[PDB]
Amino acid sequence: NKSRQKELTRWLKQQSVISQRWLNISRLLGFVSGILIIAQAWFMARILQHMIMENIPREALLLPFTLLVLTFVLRAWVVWLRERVGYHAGQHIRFAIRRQVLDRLQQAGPAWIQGKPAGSWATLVLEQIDDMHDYYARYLPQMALAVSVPLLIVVAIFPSNWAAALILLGTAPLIPLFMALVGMGAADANRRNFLALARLSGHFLDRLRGMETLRIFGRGEAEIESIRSASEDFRQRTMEVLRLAFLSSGILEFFTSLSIALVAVYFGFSYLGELDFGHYDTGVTLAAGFLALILAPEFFQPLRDLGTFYHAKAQAVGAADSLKTFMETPLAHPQRGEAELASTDPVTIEAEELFITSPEGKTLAGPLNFTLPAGQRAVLVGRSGSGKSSLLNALSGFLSYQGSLRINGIELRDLSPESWRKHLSWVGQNPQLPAATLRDNVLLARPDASEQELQAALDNAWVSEFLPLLPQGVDTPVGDQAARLSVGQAQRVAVARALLNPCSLLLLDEPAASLDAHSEQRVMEALNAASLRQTTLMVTHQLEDLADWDVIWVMQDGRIIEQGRYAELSVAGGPFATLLAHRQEEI
Amino acid sequence: MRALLPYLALYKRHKWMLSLGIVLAIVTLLASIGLLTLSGWFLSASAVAGVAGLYSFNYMLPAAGVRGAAITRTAGRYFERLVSHDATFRVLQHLRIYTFSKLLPLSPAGLAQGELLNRVVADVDTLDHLYLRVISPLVGAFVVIMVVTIGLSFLDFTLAFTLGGIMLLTLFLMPPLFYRAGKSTGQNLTHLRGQYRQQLTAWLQGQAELTIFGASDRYRTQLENTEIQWLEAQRRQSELTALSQAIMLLIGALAVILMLWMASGGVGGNAQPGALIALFVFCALAAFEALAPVTGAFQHLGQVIASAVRISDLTDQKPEVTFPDTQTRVADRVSLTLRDVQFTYPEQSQQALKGISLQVNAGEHIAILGRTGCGKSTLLQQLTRAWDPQQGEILLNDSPIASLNEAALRQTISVVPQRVHLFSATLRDNLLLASPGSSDEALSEILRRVGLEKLLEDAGLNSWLGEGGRQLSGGELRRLAIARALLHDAPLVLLDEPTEGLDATTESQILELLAEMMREKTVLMVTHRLRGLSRFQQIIVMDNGQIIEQGTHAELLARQGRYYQFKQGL
């Protein structure tokens, strides 16, 4: 009831209502499978009795053989239909869960997305959502088939011989009785074995990622023993659980073997005259005996096939564990207003008692009390981890805040994000080029731009000086994660994208941090000029060239601890002078 | 199929465990077939005998059959699951050890990445599937058909070869036919999955950029369009599995119909078979369970073969460094000398840069100061023998570095890398890495004297590091690298950009930590930061891979060369 295995299994069925139409069709077609199985067994039992007992030649039995062939062809048709319907049930659930996951992930914003590597979000969205398919496509339909076919077998056998129907029905309550004893606790113990297996896989991946450290210390040979010990420890731990978990397989194989033997023994001795019960005082026939024998392995087959689907369920429960907690983590979600910024002129950012909050509730920047007049450029400086980058994300709308942050006297909470972000241009380190071609990436800011405007942007950002080096020129595919372009020229494309449309506010988050010596000289040259056209807020540790910037904010531990122009701060001996001296120690 | 040969060779270890699992799979299937065939014959024989034949009919011998078959089927299934799972965990352990042992000699340069290693781990997981998912069902199906055909030919050769022939013909023809029919769909499926992952990663990583520029909604629209195409390829692949499952039911239908028809005419010489008709039709009914996993097994062979090639492409690379077998004695004092060796890559200079050829006496600290943003330093790699120096020669204690066996080389050189790795194990295991045998208290005093007090505050040495928890910040993570090098206690210490990405407070503490702890060792410290270089006996400043000048910090300022310009804030 309260186990994590049952909690995750309830979650999986809560998502299955997306395709309840498909699961009802599949359950209805499984009921047709049961009827065709019985019609199969009834025709074979009649043909067998005629040839074995009444010695009717096979040339006189074309009607039963013909009907037997149709019920075989119909069975293959229903198996074809159920397999196709089963896929549709899985597909429309995965499509809906993926939409919810991407909705929750777009709406949480880049503040939460960058908390994890993008390959771990791809595991959640691709691998783990797809690990749930076979549970909906195969396992859940097989559960329905395991309680419809066996009861329909019993209903078919019961009129012919109630003793034979009792042999099958007698074993029915014992299998769930085993579930109470073992297999309810073993199922959750197995769920932890699959977690330990995934953790053992991350133990091996950890040793692979650290082979460079293992090499320099000469620990490679002693790390084979750690791989062997961890694997040996996993196997012994898992095999203790499986010695109990595999008892379901054997017990189901025992009760299917006992039922076939009991049906054979009961009918066989009834023919010999030893027994005289169960046949409704009419007489036991070979057709009645064959009908129960053909349908005795069919009574247990849906349950035996359900153990063939154990791993479909086990990997969906493992996937549901990651997807249930993802969908349930509370998130900050900065609230969006309806107000719009009327003018297109540079804004006047004002903040008082402003606290910036991470999507998880953590406070990233303490009390901020700055003021930035229109058209003025300011710089954030400070030690890494002091919350400089968090202030730029609050202004972008990516972070919620407790305080005041007024753009033109209007709180940033009340500004509609769509209208506010059309007055916003941003260049950061680690440029992202989502589009396909280099012309599409630059023109992403506004596709309606004219060719004359585009060429001006490609010239001011110095993109055109490396276009000849590119194979196709401006219409060059950029590649996966800008593989064609080096980081120096990818960042210049981001600069071209930013200055394609002059705006009200320009946010720069260390634009030239890791660029080469040349692109840095051209990225800054373009941004030095751009910063004069509108209100600019830049984050740097390149303190040696801040003379022309009219405001400098020194941020430490989430608050502004110093202010003023470069001339005053460089000689005041405050925290900026310490940072400037530390910066000058670089070559 | 030739690709699986090296992984097939790995099955020699635990050959008995693996073959017992297949034998138990065969015995379980034969017991299922034998139990139904014996029951089908027993009903017919007793019905034909009737009440008058009670005294003549022998039922003690079938009684041992149904008792024996029921026991060997339930015990066979239980132990087939146990033995084949145990064997599957054995082969995974040996696949992991084998892959790790192959990847280790080609560690730094062979692997070139986080996406690669996640794919290497998943490929090893797929090679582990070859036994239960592929080999066990295919071999088990073949032997069951042969045993049934052979055993059932003692009654009639024509009937046995008709049922055995149909089962053999579907075993060998249908899986390749369905593997070929869906190979076109399985390629559009891999292409569409990788395209979706690329569009998803670009949409997630560029979320700040897309939202600001108003494109986040239309780049999710083409992401959903790729998913729709991807789900259309999955639907096509499900329709192929739907066909194979339906055709399997018709082939089983044909065998039953043929046995009903053909055996009615006569079984063996008997033109009036009677009970022997039900023997053949019930064998045909039960025998097709053995072929249930077979087409799905041959599909998974495509994934297993793909992973086997992919792993072999990686572990069959040539290691570019070889180590002798000489049992050299590690010296307590190391004097490194270089001759005509390059400090950094060519960096597209195309100037045929000459070697550095510096000399490090025993006990002396030398700092190599190089321009930021130039060609990346490669002196660390060819001093730990990541790759052999193509030009010049590196002598370690007036002997060539290539003359050291790996055990001695790793023990005479301790390096603190720029990228320090946190293994997921406990804090004690992250330090016992450097020195395998260390007292628990001698281990803890290192954490105190390098300034890592916070790591002994509560969980202490047993605290779980790495991905399990307790991520370390860049400053305290650097002190972990230095703690390992102190525990290793090699005569020569190699520091690569130790004070990079550190605040002035942490940078000063770590530099002072180097001087007092590493006083008696030669350190060759490579940085582009001017801090704390007065302690070093020799400073080597170089531009474009050539020593511009070199000398102690005192006399190096007096010359007013390139170093003096750096001290001017240039």
Ligand code: HEB
């Ligand atoms: C402990 C936990 C676990 C684990 C870990 C595992 C792991 C595993 N596995 Fe397992 N299984 C299980 C638990 C398990 N398992 C179970 C419970 C079952 C059931 C059986 C029956 O029911 O019949 C199976 C069953 C099974 C099978 C049969 C069925 C089907 O068809 O599917 C197989 C083949 C397998 C494989 C396998 C593998 C390969 C592996 C590696 C990864 N599997």
